[PDB]
Homo-oligomer: A and B are copies of this chain.
Amino acid sequence: MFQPLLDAYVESASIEKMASKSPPPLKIAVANWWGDEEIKEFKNSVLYFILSQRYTITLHQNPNEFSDLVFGNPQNAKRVFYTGENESPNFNLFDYAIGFDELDFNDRYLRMPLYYDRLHHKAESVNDTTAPYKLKDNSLYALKKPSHCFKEKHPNLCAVVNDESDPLKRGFASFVASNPNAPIRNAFYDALNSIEPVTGGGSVRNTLGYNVKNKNEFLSQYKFNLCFENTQGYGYVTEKIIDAYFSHTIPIYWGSPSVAKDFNPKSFVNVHDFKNFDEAIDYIKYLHTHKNAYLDMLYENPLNTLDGKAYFYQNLSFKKILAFFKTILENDTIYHDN
């Protein structure tokens, strides 16, 4: 049930209006070894989008210009490490880091998992007159002119979300990956497949004859999505589980053993909850033949709730991200090795 997840995301993107004040110039250098795809990706990331609400940003890649921040990936400016990969920061080289780890280093570290960036992209993709998902009026993401192509590209997704189709009347499970260097993910596929065909849409264990072009439309056509990170790490929760919620399919998840902190455990299969794969495949089999249990799970809020409100673990929000950077900009200390 993606809608409540989008509602909380849209709320977490809420920030004070700045009428009286004007977005001050902020100059951000990107490290030299950063490719051009890396730069395109950063410029389109939720981080860049967030900062762009409070600063007039200039992004460059010139080591000779005095900048306010420098973003890298392993000068005398403040260096910020920002990874979308399962890599802990090196605090000897970087003053500040943005990652996945469940760690507290006061002002030096901020946990901002890639799932949050994926939510940003989804939110923008439903600012569309044809989308089955709704954004609160006058919220930041509804500010821009909407598109009108959503229903066209996702007929089956819209159909199911629009109650114009039965979720129980679809295939078993999808699996979309193109990185073959993930032994646990590959072994889990083989194991579940041999118990019920699992449909492959990416380079790996493919069974379509081509690689799907629209993952969300593709995932909308099955009851479950094999949702495995490519390696285990505590707090390492990427775009994958989001894609499953968004496509209205049950995530069968593996990756961060602490994933229940970030998402409501009644909303998905957490393979980490079992002692072995057989036991998890058992629960999946059960879900697939007991329509009410399958249904309950599909309609659960993806987010946990406390004090009568759905929430993002540790209150991840635009304000949290903006305060983290506001603290970096005002603090003169250089922590990296000189």
In the complex, the answer to whether A103 meets B102 with C-beta atoms within 8 Å is: no
Q: A258: shortest Cβ distance to chain B, in Å? A: 10
> A interface, by DSSP: helix, strand, loop or mixed?
loop
In the complex, the answer to whether B101 meets A103 with C-beta atoms within 8 Å is: no
Q: A194: shortest Cβ distance to chain B, in Å? A: 25
In the complex, the answer to whether B92 meets A91 with C-beta atoms within 8 Å is: no
Q: Out of B88, B335, B338, which one reaches A91, CB within 8 Å?
A: B88
In the complex, the answer to whether A92 meets B102 with C-beta atoms within 8 Å is: no
> What interface size band does chain A fall in?
10 to 19
Decide yes or no whether A152 CB sits under 8 A from chain B. no
In the complex, the answer to whether A101 meets B106 with C-beta atoms within 8 Å is: no
Decide yes or no whether A105 CB sits under 8 A from chain B. yes
0/1 interface trace, chain A 71-110, chain B, CB 8 Å (1 if under): 0000000000000000110111000000001111110000
On chain B, the residues within 8 Å of A234 by CB distance are: 335
A281-B110 Cα distance, complex, nearest whole Å = 38
Q: A89: shortest Cβ distance to chain B, in Å? A: 8
Decide yes or no whether A231 CB sits under 8 A from chain B. yes
On chain B, the residues within 8 Å of A338 by CB distance are: 231-232
On chain B, the residues within 8 Å of A90 by CB distance are: 88, 90
In the complex, the answer to whether B104 meets A104 with C-beta atoms within 8 Å is: yes
Q: A98: shortest Cβ distance to chain B, in Å? A: 15
Q: Out of B87, B92, B103, B335, which one reaches A105, CB within 8 Å?
A: B103
A337-B181 Cα distance, complex, nearest whole Å = 14
Q: Out of B101, B105, B232, which one reaches A101, CB within 8 Å?
A: B105
Q: A298: shortest Cβ distance to chain B, in Å? A: 31
Nearest B-chain residue to A232, judged by Cβ: B338
Given A231-B338, A338-B231, are A92 and B87 also a contact pair (CB < 8 Å)? yes
A337-B91 Cα distance, complex, nearest whole Å = 18
On chain B, the residues within 8 Å of A87 by CB distance are: 92
A338-B234 Cα distance, complex, nearest whole Å = 14
A337-B338 Cα distance, complex, nearest whole Å = 28
Q: A131: shortest Cβ distance to chain B, in Å? A: 40
In the complex, the answer to whether A92 meets B88 with C-beta atoms within 8 Å is: yes
Sampled A-B contacts (18; CB under 8 Å): A87-B92, A88-B90, A88-B91, A88-B92, A90-B90, A91-B101, A101-B105, A102-B105, A102-B106, A103-B103, A103-B104, A103-B105, A103-B106, A104-B105, A231-B337, A231-B338, A232-B338, A234-B335
Ranked 6 nearest A-B pairs via Cβ: A88-B91, A104-B104, A103-B105, A88-B92, A87-B92, A90-B90
